[PDB]
Amino acid sequence: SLARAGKVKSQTPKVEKTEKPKKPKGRAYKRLLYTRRFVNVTLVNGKRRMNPG
């Protein structure tokens, strides 16, 4: 039935965003990704990984 549309979005707590420093856009972002992925930072976990736990 109707009169239930938006139930979860309505009763979803409004967690506000967390201010962080901006990311460098463009060629600087490509540089940041290249260093994060190909200087062998501690992200391997055996072979390779891209998110923590």
Binding site: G26, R27, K30, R31, L33, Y34, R37, F38
Partner: protein
């Protein structure tokens, strides 16, 4: 109305968007050559594919054919002039074996770094973009320039753009004007 204006695309996207090996190779190229995005790699691969198709169509023709000879010689001349094709590989079969890195090396952003004018490819990129590099007597503020193997001995700083000239800059002016007051007088 006036004649149509001809225009062509200079790149081509990959068929498979999310191939991890291709993404890693593209990121390696972008990091090594200080590229802004994947569109520059796409453009280089598109140019390489056009050249490869031309050389293939020429190689299907019989040897000493007039058209094959003329067009292959012209293509080899252009590639060695731009320095992508080495001087010992003027055969039209090593043209087929050209790579993306061969074109990316002749970039002005790569050459400014390899000539010691910059500390990194990204430093060369910002220096070129900020009009600091002159190829001959002409400022070239575009990292993709394809130095012609004779302008390489001429890549230097411009008379303007105060790393190769007289003026002391723009932020140095305000810094001096603030330091004169901060000194006390």
């Amino acid at each position: 109305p006036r004649a149509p204006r001809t225009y062509s695309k200079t790149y081509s996207t990959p068929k498979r968007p999310y191939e991890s090996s291709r993404l890693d190779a593209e990121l390696k190229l972008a990091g090594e050559f200080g590229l802004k995005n994947k569109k520059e790699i796409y453009r280089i691969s598109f140019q390489l594919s056009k050249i490869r198709r031309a050389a293939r169509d020429l190689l299907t023709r019989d040897e000493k054919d007039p058209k094959r000879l003329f067009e292959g010689n012209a293509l080899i001349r252009r590639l060695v002039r731009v320095g992508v094709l080495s001087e010992d590989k003027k055969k039209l079969d090593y043209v087929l074996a050209l790579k993306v890195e061969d074109f990316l090396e002749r970039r002005l952003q790569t050459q400014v770094y390899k000539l010691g004018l910059a500390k990194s490819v990204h430093h060369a990129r910002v220096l070129i973009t900020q009009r600091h590099i002159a190829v001959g007597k002409q400022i070239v503020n575009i990292p993709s320039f394809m130095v012609r193997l004779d302008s390489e001995k001429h890549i230097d700083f411009a008379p303007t753009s105060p790393f190769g000239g007289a003026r002391p800059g723009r932020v140095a002016r305000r810094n001096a004007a603030r330091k004169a007051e901060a000194s006390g007088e």
